[PDB]
Amino acid sequence: VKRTYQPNKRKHSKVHGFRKRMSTKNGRKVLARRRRKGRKVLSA
Amino acid sequence: AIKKYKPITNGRRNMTSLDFAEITKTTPEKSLLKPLPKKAGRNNQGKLTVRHHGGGHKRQYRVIDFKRNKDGINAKVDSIQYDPNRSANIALVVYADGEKRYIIAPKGLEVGQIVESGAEADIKVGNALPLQNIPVGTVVHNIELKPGKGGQIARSAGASAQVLGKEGKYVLIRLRSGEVRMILSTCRATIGQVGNLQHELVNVGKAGRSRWKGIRPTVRGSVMNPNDHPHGGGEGRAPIGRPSPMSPWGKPTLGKKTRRGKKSSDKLIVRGRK
RNA sequence: CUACCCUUGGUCAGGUUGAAGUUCAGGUAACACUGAAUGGAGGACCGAACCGACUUACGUUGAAAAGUGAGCGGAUGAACU
RNA sequence: UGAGUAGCGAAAGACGGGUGAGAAUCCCGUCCACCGAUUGACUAAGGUUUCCAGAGGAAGGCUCGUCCGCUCUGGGUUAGUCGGGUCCUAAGCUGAGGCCGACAGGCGUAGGCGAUGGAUAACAGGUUGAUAUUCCUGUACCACCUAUAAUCGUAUCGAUGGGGGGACGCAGUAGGAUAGGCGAAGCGUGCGAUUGGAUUGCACGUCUAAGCAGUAAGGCUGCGGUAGCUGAGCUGUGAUGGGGAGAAGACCUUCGAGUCGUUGAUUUCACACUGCCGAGAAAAGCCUCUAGAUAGAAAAUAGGUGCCCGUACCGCAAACCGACACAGGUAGUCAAGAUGAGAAUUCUAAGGUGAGCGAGCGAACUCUCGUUAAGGAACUCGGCAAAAUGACCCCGUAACUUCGGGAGAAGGGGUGCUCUUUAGGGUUAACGCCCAGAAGAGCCGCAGUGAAUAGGCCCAAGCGACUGUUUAUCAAAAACACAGGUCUCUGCUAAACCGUAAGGUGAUGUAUAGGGGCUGACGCCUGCCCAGU
RNA sequence: UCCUAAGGUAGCGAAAUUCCUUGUCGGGUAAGUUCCGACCCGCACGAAAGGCGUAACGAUUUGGGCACUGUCUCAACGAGA
RNA sequence: UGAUAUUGAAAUUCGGCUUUCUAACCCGCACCACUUAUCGUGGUGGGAGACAGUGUCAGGCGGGCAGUUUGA
């Protein structure tokens, strides 16, 4: 059957990209939490 | 002038359609068209605010001249064409200087002459004249309410009004619905009655013919669930159950008047519709 | 993913039936009403692709956390993508 | 522990050589078998080195392994023209000032971003273990620079703007051409396995763009509005004193090989013409207009310049999504012969593949298939399942109907092969090639649509008119929807609705209109009560 | 003769509605708690949460026939996993 | 739906509901300028007008929505 996840390079960067997390105050608070925790990947 | 098909198939059994014999040009004016995308009854927030809207055939918008702005220039009817945006037809008039415009096609009008000016134009179908120069007893359409804004009343297929006695600054008029009110004498109006009077005698025939017009199904509130409609649901078919029928949002929808309590127009209405 | 909608694209081997209208010739004070051709309308007919899931068998620490075999429905449209 | 128990994931393999410590499983060869509207050939998304060569067998591969999409080492992607950027724009998303909000921030104008569409200059061969419209060979085209020659100027370049153009739906039939097919000795093979053959039996029969010619059919007649025009498939010279070429004389070598008349024909090349009602984006390139700017070599000569990103490989699959080397899912394009209406059916071509555990025996039982004497629903909650009917031609067919239907009603008869024949036809100097019928006379079998593919029907009731829709994953229905009917609210900054602010939908609509409740084609009808709410 | 705002009209009726109930009387069967046609004692039908009819349509429910058959009387043999 | 603030004039009238006038306030009304965009600002006309809109206080309706109770 058709599974839930269908990869798409463009749609993945427009929804969870770095530039879209900086366009919102709530999105910026996401990168501040990942930085404070020591993650190697910040977005995407 | 109403074609009636033969019962060769179901749905087409009792279906009827117009004749279109009054049309003379099946091609619009390329210089008077504009795009008109569909909204589907959704707000600028992206949410659905009006139900039963969606789909339909692609349409283009024709620019209509509801103000009739010019000085005693005589125009000529060039052709009558079909307009999908309204219930009435439209006529293309050409003026003695070359300007082309669109106007609503009155009843029983052919390729002749038309003039738009006050105190000089005659009382004949086609001419637009201020209510001051209109004697009591005439039938007018495309009536205005604000000087220079454009006609907004009696603009449907087979619609018109009747000019009653004038009273000082205002004139008494009887609208199609039956109401009587006053309008400023400086408002413009056109003589005659909107044509295409056999438009309401049509039988759609089948459900698919209304789908490509832009209407979606209408689910009755009595077959819904309790958390979806005040009529909710019981065991099997049930009556209304309440003292008065409700709307989808919880308001009486039978004989409850929704007109606002206080407004400026209240002084200009003599007797409501009956 | 799924439900509805918006803008812009694509797809449906083959066969069958023969509505309105039109045309000539008999009609007729005028119409009416008849014929033989032309004509190709339809949520129309049979049936692949494609889209659906009515019956039954098998499988149910399965090949598969919903499938497979054999029949079955729609198939120019309220169609599918 | 269960236990050396279940399982080892749809399918045809056999033998002879080679390698090696070790071979049913790796390599080569010959037979056999399977797909072939395809398991074949190209290409978007997605994956991200899985691609090539030599060298390896610990682990991974449901067995084995000398082998690998696994390990080690070294390699592989070449563009002015192909697809995207220095071009345009739909939806939508963001918007200097501005409007509105306890704070954040929500709306919105000019202006920008944004293809799934519009505009836009290259083709045919050759070559590597791994790239090819990119490299190479042969011939083209577009934009932009530089110098030097034709009119011996009161020409030239034009907007930031104006007007044309671009520019658009669905259905149906006919017609003109061309691809790919088929049949004939125009060329190269070759003529004999086992009984008689010798108009024997095989295979081939091609060639771009661009640039010059004239070309079926199409639309249109004396700057914008008012009162011998434009486009057009195909054909033919040459390009090509080349390229390719089934084969030949020689056991990345040199070298002279044939390109023709006839038939049948698109789903490819025109929204062209015609009809219909549901009435079918935009913008730029492009061609004009004058504002103004006040000065040349775009039909032509000889030389120069032209950037950035993608290009390997898989792509109905072992590489994509599914925890797996998983009977599942995944857009578009190319579409051969016999049979046929056909892309159905059976067998084959081009080109692929033989499935990653086997060998024996032929118990019970279970699963998937094939027959069965005499009865024929006696089975069972119930004809569940199975069986039967099935294509084409020709006769013929009831009650009821809203006159269209019912209807393929129900029933019955024909069907192979050979011969003898005669004013249907299409294409053409004849001839020949193709398509298609009515008669008569014969032959063979238990059987002639001899295989495969293809409606059981009929007499009566309940419900809903009808096509359609619904509980992804135990309910497809009498449930929802529907055309029609009726009540009621709304005169426009409309009612209703979201936010309940701005701003929006309704609607670029105006009572023949819009919102809400209840009924549910059509036909005949729809009675009485207003004390209560 | 009491009471009420008025005391159910046309049509239909053991019905997707009838508890008594397998009501009773006629059809179909050798045998019919189901089915069809009629009777009204309608517990508890009824006119737009409409009443009564209706051609054409249905992978809808229901009863009776023809054809056919391993469904069965009653089992037997063969092929493959 | 009333009181009061924003909110000023004149007259009728057996510390006043009502005809009445422009000057506050309002106009998804028109023509101009910013500007070859009408979102917005400003100016001139027209319409309306001390009403409407807005703040505080008060009364009524209000399963539309919310928190809870419904014994042994």
Short mmCIF file of N, CA, C and O (backbone and C1' of nucleotides) in Angstrom, two decimals, chain D residues 295-315:
data_model
loop_
_atom_site.label_atom_id
_atom_site.label_comp_id
_atom_site.label_asym_id
_atom_site.label_seq_id
_atom_site.Cartn_x
_atom_site.Cartn_y
_atom_site.Cartn_z
P A D 295 22.49 61.94 -31.87
"O5'" A D 295 22.53 60.75 -32.94
"C5'" A D 295 23.76 60.13 -33.29
"C4'" A D 295 23.72 59.57 -34.69
"C3'" A D 295 25.07 59.15 -35.26
"O3'" A D 295 24.89 58.04 -36.14
"C1'" A D 295 24.14 60.86 -36.60
P G D 296 25.45 56.59 -35.74
"O5'" G D 296 25.18 55.70 -37.04
"C5'" G D 296 23.88 55.20 -37.33
"C4'" G D 296 23.91 54.18 -38.44
"C3'" G D 296 24.93 53.06 -38.26
"O3'" G D 296 24.42 51.86 -38.85
"C1'" G D 296 25.43 54.26 -40.23
P A D 297 25.02 50.43 -38.42
"O5'" A D 297 25.93 50.01 -39.66
"C5'" A D 297 25.36 49.83 -40.95
"C4'" A D 297 26.21 48.92 -41.81
"C3'" A D 297 26.73 47.66 -41.14
"O3'" A D 297 25.77 46.62 -41.12
"C1'" A D 297 28.49 48.72 -42.32
P A D 298 24.41 46.78 -40.28
"O5'" A D 298 23.75 45.33 -40.32
"C5'" A D 298 24.37 44.23 -39.68
"C4'" A D 298 23.38 43.15 -39.35
"C3'" A D 298 22.42 42.76 -40.46
"O3'" A D 298 23.01 41.87 -41.40
"C1'" A D 298 21.21 43.06 -38.46
P A D 299 23.14 42.32 -42.94
"O5'" A D 299 22.39 41.17 -43.75
"C5'" A D 299 21.05 40.80 -43.42
"C4'" A D 299 20.37 40.16 -44.59
"C3'" A D 299 21.26 39.31 -45.49
"O3'" A D 299 21.49 38.01 -44.98
"C1'" A D 299 19.97 40.77 -46.83
P A D 300 23.00 37.52 -44.71
"O5'" A D 300 23.86 38.84 -44.97
"C5'" A D 300 25.28 38.79 -44.99
"C4'" A D 300 25.83 39.19 -46.33
"C3'" A D 300 27.35 39.27 -46.43
"O3'" A D 300 27.95 38.01 -46.63
"C1'" A D 300 26.38 41.20 -47.41
P U D 301 29.24 37.59 -45.77
"O5'" U D 301 30.37 38.61 -46.24
"C5'" U D 301 30.86 38.59 -47.57
"C4'" U D 301 32.29 39.07 -47.63
"C3'" U D 301 33.24 38.41 -46.64
"O3'" U D 301 33.73 37.16 -47.08
"C1'" U D 301 33.51 40.75 -46.55
P A D 302 33.99 35.98 -46.03
"O5'" A D 302 35.33 36.43 -45.29
"C5'" A D 302 36.53 36.63 -46.02
"C4'" A D 302 37.62 37.21 -45.15
"C3'" A D 302 37.87 36.51 -43.83
"O3'" A D 302 38.65 35.34 -43.96
"C1'" A D 302 37.79 38.84 -43.48
P G D 303 38.78 34.31 -42.73
"O5'" G D 303 39.49 35.17 -41.60
"C5'" G D 303 39.52 34.73 -40.25
"C4'" G D 303 40.01 35.81 -39.33
"C3'" G D 303 39.88 35.53 -37.84
"O3'" G D 303 40.93 34.73 -37.34
"C1'" G D 303 39.06 37.70 -38.30
P G D 304 40.74 33.88 -35.99
"O5'" G D 304 40.43 34.99 -34.89
"C5'" G D 304 39.98 34.62 -33.59
"C4'" G D 304 39.62 35.84 -32.77
"C3'" G D 304 38.78 35.57 -31.53
"O3'" G D 304 39.56 35.15 -30.42
"C1'" G D 304 37.85 37.37 -32.75
P U D 305 39.14 33.83 -29.60
"O5'" U D 305 37.99 34.34 -28.63
"C5'" U D 305 38.25 35.32 -27.64
"C4'" U D 305 36.98 35.83 -27.01
"C3'" U D 305 36.05 34.76 -26.45
"O3'" U D 305 36.44 34.30 -25.17
"C1'" U D 305 34.80 36.30 -27.74
P G D 306 36.17 32.78 -24.74
"O5'" G D 306 34.60 32.71 -24.47
"C5'" G D 306 34.02 33.45 -23.40
"C4'" G D 306 32.51 33.45 -23.49
"C3'" G D 306 31.83 32.09 -23.49
"O3'" G D 306 31.70 31.56 -22.19
"C1'" G D 306 30.89 33.46 -25.18
P C D 307 32.23 30.08 -21.85
"O5'" C D 307 32.22 30.02 -20.26
"C5'" C D 307 33.11 30.82 -19.49
"C4'" C D 307 32.41 31.42 -18.29
"C3'" C D 307 31.70 30.44 -17.37
"O3'" C D 307 32.58 29.80 -16.46
"C1'" C D 307 30.28 32.28 -17.82
P C D 308 32.25 28.32 -15.93
"O5'" C D 308 31.06 28.53 -14.89
"C5'" C D 308 31.26 29.22 -13.67
"C4'" C D 308 30.00 29.27 -12.85
"C3'" C D 308 29.34 27.93 -12.56
"O3'" C D 308 29.93 27.24 -11.47
"C1'" C D 308 27.71 29.45 -13.32
P C D 309 30.09 25.64 -11.52
"O5'" C D 309 28.60 25.09 -11.32
"C5'" C D 309 27.93 25.25 -10.08
"C4'" C D 309 26.53 24.70 -10.13
"C3'" C D 309 26.38 23.26 -10.59
"O3'" C D 309 26.66 22.32 -9.57
"C1'" C D 309 24.80 24.60 -11.71
P G D 310 27.34 20.91 -9.93
"O5'" G D 310 26.20 20.12 -10.71
"C5'" G D 310 25.01 19.72 -10.05
"C4'" G D 310 24.08 18.96 -10.98
"C3'" G D 310 24.71 17.86 -11.81
"O3'" G D 310 24.91 16.66 -11.08
"C1'" G D 310 23.30 19.17 -13.18
P U D 311 26.19 15.74 -11.37
"O5'" U D 311 25.88 15.06 -12.78
"C5'" U D 311 24.68 14.34 -13.00
"C4'" U D 311 24.50 13.96 -14.45
"C3'" U D 311 25.52 12.96 -14.99
"O3'" U D 311 24.89 12.11 -15.95
"C1'" U D 311 25.62 14.95 -16.25
P A D 312 24.68 10.55 -15.65
"O5'" A D 312 26.08 10.08 -15.03
"C5'" A D 312 27.16 9.70 -15.87
"C4'" A D 312 28.05 8.69 -15.18
"C3'" A D 312 27.38 7.37 -14.81
"O3'" A D 312 27.35 6.45 -15.88
"C1'" A D 312 28.56 8.22 -12.94
P C D 313 25.94 5.89 -16.43
"O5'" C D 313 25.40 4.98 -15.23
"C5'" C D 313 25.99 3.72 -14.95
"C4'" C D 313 25.55 3.19 -13.61
"C3'" C D 313 24.05 2.95 -13.43
"O3'" C D 313 23.62 1.72 -13.98
"C1'" C D 313 24.89 4.13 -11.57
P C D 314 22.18 1.61 -14.69
"O5'" C D 314 21.16 1.39 -13.48
"C5'" C D 314 21.16 0.19 -12.73
"C4'" C D 314 20.28 0.29 -11.51
"C3'" C D 314 18.82 0.63 -11.77
"O3'" C D 314 18.05 -0.50 -12.13
"C1'" C D 314 19.66 1.99 -10.02
P G D 315 17.15 -0.48 -13.46
"O5'" G D 315 15.97 0.54 -13.13
"C5'" G D 315 15.03 0.26 -12.10
"C4'" G D 315 14.40 1.53 -11.58
"C3'" G D 315 13.52 2.29 -12.56
"O3'" G D 315 12.20 1.78 -12.63
"C1'" G D 315 15.01 3.79 -11.49
#
